[PDB]
Amino acid sequence: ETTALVCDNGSGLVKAGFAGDDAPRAVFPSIVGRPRHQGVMVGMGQKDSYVGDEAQSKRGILTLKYPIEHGIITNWDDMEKIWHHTFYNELRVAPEEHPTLLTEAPLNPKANREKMTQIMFETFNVPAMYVAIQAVLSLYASGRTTGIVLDSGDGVTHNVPIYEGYALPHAIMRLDLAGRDLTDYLMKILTERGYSFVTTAEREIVRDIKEKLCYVALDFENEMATAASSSSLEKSYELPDGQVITIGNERFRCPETLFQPSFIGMESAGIHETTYNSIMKCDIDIRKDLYANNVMSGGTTMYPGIADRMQKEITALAPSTMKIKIIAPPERKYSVWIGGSILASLSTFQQMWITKQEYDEAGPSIVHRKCF
Amino acid sequence: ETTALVCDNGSGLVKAGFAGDDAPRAVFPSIVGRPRHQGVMVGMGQKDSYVGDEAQSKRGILTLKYPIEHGIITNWDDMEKIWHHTFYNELRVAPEEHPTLLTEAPLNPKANREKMTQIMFETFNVPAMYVAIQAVLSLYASGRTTGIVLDSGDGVTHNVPIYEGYALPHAIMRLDLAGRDLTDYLMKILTERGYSFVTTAEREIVRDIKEKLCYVALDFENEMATAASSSSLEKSYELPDGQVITIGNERFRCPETLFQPSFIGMESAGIHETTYNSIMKCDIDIRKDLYANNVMSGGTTMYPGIADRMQKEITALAPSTMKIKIIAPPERKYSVWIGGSILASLSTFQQMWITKQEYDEAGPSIVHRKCF
Amino acid sequence: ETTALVCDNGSGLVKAGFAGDDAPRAVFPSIVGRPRHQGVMVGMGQKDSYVGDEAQSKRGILTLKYPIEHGIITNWDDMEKIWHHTFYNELRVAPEEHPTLLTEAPLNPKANREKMTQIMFETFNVPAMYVAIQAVLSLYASGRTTGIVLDSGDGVTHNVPIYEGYALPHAIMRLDLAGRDLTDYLMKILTERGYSFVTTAEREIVRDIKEKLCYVALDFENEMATAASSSSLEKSYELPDGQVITIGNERFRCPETLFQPSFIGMESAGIHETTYNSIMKCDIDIRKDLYANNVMSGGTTMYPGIADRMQKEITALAPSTMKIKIIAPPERKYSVWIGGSILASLSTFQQMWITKQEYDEAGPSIVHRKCF
Amino acid sequence: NATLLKFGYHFTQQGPRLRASNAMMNNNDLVRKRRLADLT
Numbered sequence A, B, C: 001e002t003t004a005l006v007c008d009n010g011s012g013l014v015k016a017g018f019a020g021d022d023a024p025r026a027v028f029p030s031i032v033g034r035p036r037h038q039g040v041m042v043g044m045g046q047k048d049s050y051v052g053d054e055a056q057s058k059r060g061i062l063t064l065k066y067p068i069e070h071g072i073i074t075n076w077d078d079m080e081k082i083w084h085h086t087f088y089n090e091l092r093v094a095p096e097e098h099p100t101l102l103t104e105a106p107l108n109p110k111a112n113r114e115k116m117t118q119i120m121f122e123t124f125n126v127p128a129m130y131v132a133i134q135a136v137l138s139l140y141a142s143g144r145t146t147g148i149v150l151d152s153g154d155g156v157t158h159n160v161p162i163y164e165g166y167a168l169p170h171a172i173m174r175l176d177l178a179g180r181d182l183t184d185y186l187m188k189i190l191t192e193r194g195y196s197f198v199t200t201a202e203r204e205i206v207r208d209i210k211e212k213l214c215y216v217a218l219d220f221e222n223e224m225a226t227a228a229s230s231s232s233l234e235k236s237y238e239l240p241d242g243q244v245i246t247i248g249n250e251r252f253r254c255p256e257t258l259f260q261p262s263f264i265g266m267e268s269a270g271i272h273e274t275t276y277n278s279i280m281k282c283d284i285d286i287r288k289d290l291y292a293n294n295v296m297s298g299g300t301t302m303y304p305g306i307a308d309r310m311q312k313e314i315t316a317l318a319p320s321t322m323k324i325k326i327i328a329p330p331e332r333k334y335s336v337w338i339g340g341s342i343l344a345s346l347s348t349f350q351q352m353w354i355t356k357q358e359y360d361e362a363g364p365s366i367v368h369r370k371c372f
Numbered sequence D: 001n002a003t004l005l006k007f008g009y010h011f012t013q014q015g016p017r018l019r020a021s022n023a024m025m026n027n028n029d030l031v032r033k034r035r036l037a038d039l040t
């Protein structure tokens, strides 16, 4: 009778809703805004914060902080604010009569999962809660059992291969390059055309520019030459104060950092090389099945050139007698949540919850013996 | 129905079927696989163990164990799994209404035969069972009565001479050098060209390479010189992950261990010397009949150079006034099973079974007083 | 002068010097560094590549590559740079008037040895050169003739048994798990405490942490329980930028991969099981002499708990009526070089060199007919 | 201190960050253990 809750707390956005649905009810940015130190506006008699859409709407007098940096929860009071907002203000529900499903990226600290269990059981006290790996949920939403998931969000980009339901943790790869780094790089490279975005309120404007106008080139040098030749790749964007800006090659130079990290000074390899290295660290008899089942998930995979570019690069790296298939569904931005709704709806999952009695008896360490 | 069952449990493969047929119904590898990685997807019909073709197909996430080593059953729970699989899943039969014929290599421990009798009568309880020597069955399938059988499989290589239906147990020879040792030697010597096969899943790949590309040279030194001169003996093999390897002298260096055991550090003599020594230990008046009737059986005799090499070596060892004839039929991989089907169909054999009443009265020791 | 040179090129370090000494003259890391950023200050003795201690000192602006991976030379230009540095810059000698002794791990590709011979005779042309197995040199430095050598360095871990000067090549074991794999595993497991080491410059920091603070537990489960109970096993390390980190169970979880390879996903057995399997593959009359003469060499054997743990494990595996003795001298990090200095000083070795005339007459293949 | 349960501060260094995180988890577990012991 009790409906289960599915909550996905990424580095940048929170996607929360009810199990059994098709789309999340509440999708809001994972930011906490605090008063600015300029004494311009002191008349707003609040408590001490604004969270979510309210912080974004009032961002002209606020300083915005992200509670999660590179997939790791760094501030826990702000995380409590986010969870309180998504329980009482967005979903409009009382947490004491709904089980909760939470998500976590691979190769995270154990303390993060332990404190998630502790906060969900001692402050927002739920009958049961369960923590799951995001790539397993993405594979659940994709409908298949074997595949390698490239999950790229706002803080991390990780590759996880799974064969017939068994995961290989020694081949799990993690790269600290995601959407926020691309936003910072776009802020850096818009200064070449004379536009100056500095403050955190303008970072959201640059993020909107990136979400609306950027794309991944199939060949980088040819598209750079084409942009240098003619102004056919140039697009115009209207700022909130009515100013109009024009951008050219910056549309495709920004996501190219995902394939050439040295643009921002990182020594690592691109996502295609990382995926190929993750495939090569597995056993020889499963690589063929991983080749045909490259699954893309996350909001950073939403550029309209990335599947063809990934296919071209991986086909260049892999032997010529292999079928390389990139699986990029249109609803892949919320695949983790969709998988969570799938997982929370199974009749065979209802005995795997962690009840409050078990948490009382064992403490905040049963999350390793119960959750993968 | 009472249509007898014929089951041949070798070191590497299981050949099971019904008596009176021409070919075995179920031929599957004798391996048990168990998962070694972490399972993350709930339900989906995951099993704790896999047997036979299913274990071979899913070997990329499994550790594969052979229940039988050098013709001796080392693990009995896995052997029970193999017998349960070959009775209920492959042959699709109920064991309680079918007599069973099993095979065993010469000079095996008595405890192996005793525990085979105990398992067949107390767990998969049959009306009757009979254990036979493999070389006698090979001579049965060849259609003749006099001959010396060289049976080489996956764990053992044994010579048994028989003259007019009488066996000579003092001249029975056994060498613990067979196909699995050649597989291990091929794994060792492929490291010279930079290929590294380590895990048990790659051992099956090396076994496939050996079955497809290896052959026995008529003259070893001349073929080594020919390989050193030109790259005409080199063949290419495609790995499961699309990689292509090239092998040269390793095609004929691997089965040459059967004629020069000192390649793997053994002090024994080759198969030709062992056959000649077995011939010389018999009576003088039957050696001529043994010379004309060399019968080859087993999968290790399937290399396409071995009959001519054996004939050349034995003719070199034997006096020049003798006719040395090697009998290598095309269906010699399943000769033991064919002989078992012949033996179980005879009207003169039906009084030689070991019934359940005899086993109850005598215990698991009548298999020595009844069978050889 | 004709004072022979002894050079040991391992996976991680180069130990070079003159024969007849007690310690190597030049011990330097086997890395080549190349700049990754943009140079703006002209001159100032900037090099396009850096080798050895200079690369390690300037590693904050360099990308470091190891020319040797798992005992196999993967890049040959960098290897030529290393050899040029160790001949002209470190030893300060002219190679054309000094014979050279080089080392190689067992079961390496033949092409590696052939190209080493070709480079030493055609680019740094020596009067003579000789390639030797490292474990034989380790037994040479130990002063005895019979024993089984476990040599574990930065890329390989190999067991070689020798009885009265005769080696048994069929019992030589090789495992591709050594110090660099433990460094990578330590990098992986420090992310559990929130520390992120990604670049190759930070790999040296993690290697330094491993060399200073890690140790092998005598009982793994008891020490894990003790670490979980109290913070008495926790140690602090000061980073190059002044940050202080604290580590607990990671001190002993890192070298435990040498006894439980499944921590990094490998199907193989531990070093104690590998040593016992190497002992069991030899003849029965020499195993007792191998039991009392376990010789440890290499830098991976320098953890201060490994001899007692190896003795306990092997005594658990071996029969109780046997004396198991582990020989771990204090100078075992340079035993191979010491053995090379012993070998190059013998009067009975001077006829076993490969002169330039022999190389001219035979080509780069006499290194197989002369050296093992 | 064994009493403080929440500390609102964005640390810069991972060392103190983890020390703080462990301290808060410890204090909350003291809460848990005394809630378990007082349950007769």
Ligand SMILES: Nc1ncnc2c1ncn2[C@@H]1O[C@H](COP(=O)(O)OP(=O)(O)O)[C@@H](O)[C@H]1O
Pocket: A009, A010, A011, A012, A013, A014, A030, A152, A153, A154, A155, A179, A180, A207, A210, A211, A212, A298, A299, A300, A301, A302, A303, A333, A334
């Ligand atoms: N259409 C788009 N094109 C490119 N990037 C996008 C698009 N939509 C969203 N993003 C990026 O996806 C990131 C978050 O995606 P998602 O993975 O759903 O959230 P989280 O990372 O919080 O789990 C944001 O930083 C945003 O910049």
Ligand SMILES: Nc1ncnc2c1ncn2[C@@H]1O[C@H](COP(=O)(O)OP(=O)(O)O)[C@@H](O)[C@H]1O
Pocket: B009, B010, B011, B012, B013, B014, B152, B153, B154, B155, B179, B180, B207, B210, B211, B212, B298, B299, B300, B301, B302, B303, B333, B334
């Ligand atoms: N075409 C072939 N060439 C060489 N060897 C083969 C060939 N086919 C099978 N083998 C070898 O035969 C061995 C098993 O043969 P067989 O005697 O039928 O099984 P078992 O030894 O289990 O009774 C296997 O180890 C395999 O390596």
Ligand SMILES: Nc1ncnc2c1ncn2[C@@H]1O[C@H](COP(=O)(O)OP(=O)(O)O)[C@@H](O)[C@H]1O
Pocket: C009, C010, C011, C012, C013, C014, C152, C153, C154, C155, C179, C180, C207, C210, C211, C212, C298, C299, C300, C301, C302, C303, C333, C334
């Ligand atoms: N005190 C120590 N404790 C543990 N490991 C060490 C210690 N000193 C060196 N090592 C390891 O030994 C490895 C190299 O040892 P060595 O065998 O001398 O060099 P190579 O492997 O190049 O021949 C390095 O990777 C290093 O991590």
Ligand SMILES: [Mg+2]
Pocket: A009, A010, A011, A134, A153, A298, A336
């Ligand atoms: Mg996410």
Ligand SMILES: [Mg+2]
Pocket: B010, B134, B152, B153, B154, B298, B336
């Ligand atoms: Mg057989």
Ligand SMILES: [Mg+2]
Pocket: C010, C011, C134, C152, C153, C154, C298, C336
């Ligand atoms: Mg070494």
